[PDB]
């Protein structure tokens with residue numbers, strides 16, 4: 001028990017003001033949808049960021065502060081620990097370049113009232129950040145080894161070169177892990193996807209849908225949730241045709257949805273891949289809207305499709321390519337847990 | 341009652357063999373996923389096509405036969421009537437270049453065992469096609485004027501130039517109608533969409549989702565179905581938590597889903613736009629999973645998004661642009677109805 005880092009990398013979200021300051025570097029304001037609080041969005045990110053690095057350096061920890069474009073596998077090795085300073089976006093980016101279950105990576109919600117932060121330290125430590133560093137020293141914290149999906153590409157016509165979205169061959173290992181998910185599907189969101197899935201080495205079934213989602217326990221509150229969740233206005237629709245027991249009050253409408261959406265979440269440390277079929281098109285038959293597994297391999301039959309890991313890295317997955325997802329231990333990422 | 345066409349355009353799907361014959365014009369076979377029946381897919385499309393045009397010309401109707409690239413607004417005006425010779429794909433393409441509620445357009449399912457055809461003449465007339473032409477002469481048919489969504493772009497940063505996916509400003513009218521749907525949403529399928537909707541001139545609510553669908557009565561069996569339909573394996577999941585009346589047999593599981601999915605379809609002649617929010621993300625609050633309206637206008641707040649009409653034409657719809665959908669009479673498309 002106990003942990004003080006000697007050197008850390010702070011990798012910072014690039015705010016939406018930073019965006020245009022460099023994007024349109026080629027008054028101002030323009031549309032009323034800016035400046036009013038856009039330069040304030042920026043002012044409070046850099047505020048919090050300076051508080052973090054002021055509070056690191058004031059405890060004698062050595063910090064390099066770097067943005068999306070200057071954060072690489074080389075700086076991560078200098079780091080005893082890694083800090084994402086943004087939202088979960090930033091956390092996912094910071095986890096992308098870590099592949100070592102003993103490097104800790106910790107997210108600080110650099111802007112609470114509009115970032116979400118469900119992978120970062122509580123909103124408390126965003127502004128009382130020595131209180132965090134002290135808890136780390138004194139060991140009043142806990143280790144959360146988060147499960148991560150590992151990728152594997154083979155087949156023919158394949159191309160394992162990764163693509164930063166921020167702009168006859170053997171089984172190659174793709175160089176990102178998935179903290180949140182791996183989303184297979186067609187590029188044109190209107191072109192339907194077609195493939196053959198195989199769960200836990202079971203037989204191959206054909207499928208036609210708007211894509212495949214493949215999440216970790218921790219990623220089950222992210223995309224795999226919006227895929228599969230039900231709506232309270234459409235359980236009233238389902239429970240009223242289920243009329244022709246209960247008198248059906250509004251209190252019940254929420255207590256049937258809230259126990260349904262509660263089964264779609266499992267635990268970060270749990271080592272299962274919850275893989276759902278997004279809007280399946282039921283000929284090729286369907287069933288299993290979703291299910292838990294350990295290994296799933298899908299065979300691409302698409303024209304121009306990608307498999308996309310945590311929304312930031314993309315891989316080609318046109319007809320002839322094969323991918324294989326599996327949780328493996330040396331992938332699990334070392335997060336911390338603190339107090340309200 | 342009665343209708344004989346004097347000249348017709350037959351516009352033909354380009355088969356998947358035609359694809360590669362010209363795409364890789366830059367033995368053969370390659371992957372086992374071809375040739376076995378790929379050159380047979382082609383052999384039976386051109387077969388049926390020749391039967392159609394043989395059966396036109398043998399009744400003394402004058403036909404120009406043209407493919408995707410040679411079918412234009414000029415040939416549609418020569419035509420007394422227009423024939424799509426493919427699947428609904430082809431039908432939607434053929435309707436794209438017609439904007440005149442008195443031109444008839446008729447689809448012939450050029451390949452029944454793998455095309456679907458739910459906008460074309462029955463599978464009967466694909467091979468007994470004079471039997472169709474005779475029914476047209478003798479008036480043993482019926483006119484189906486199918487409702488069509490009409491598009492309207494304004495605002496700033498906008499760009500109303502259409503994009504064939506087959507590769508301070510006033511309200512401009514976009515030059516495609518929607519037979520099936522109009523799908524607003526972000527281009528990266530992982531980037532979330534954000535916008536402000538306004539139904540029937542009601543107030544503007546903000547929204548965050550994986551896009552917007554906007555279908556006609558006829559388009560309600562297409563995409564708007566896969567968006568909103570329920571699964572029989574996840575009503576068992578909903579009706580078993582709705583346990584803690586019925587004993588729940590498998591016969592019921594289908595009869596509650598089949599009456600739910602039955603309310604998501606309305607009639608082609610019905611002039612309402614059923615607009616659903618695709619996987620809404622409930623801060624900006626949500627409700628109304630879908631609802632009927634006559635006019636809906638949405639205000640783009642996206643970075644790199646398109647609105648896509650019938651899957652074939654795309655328009656930019658980044659922040660600052662405004663679109664407005666509405667059914668108007670001179671759009672309704674003139675289809676026929678025949679017998680089993």
Ligand SMILES: [Ca+2]
Pocket residue numbers: 050054
């Ligand atoms: Ca300072």
Ligand SMILES: [Ca+2]
Pocket residue numbers: 156157158159318
């Ligand atoms: Ca290739």
Ligand SMILES: [Ca+2]
Pocket residue numbers: 390394
């Ligand atoms: Ca002939």
Ligand SMILES: [Ca+2]
Pocket residue numbers: 496497498499658
């Ligand atoms: Ca623009």
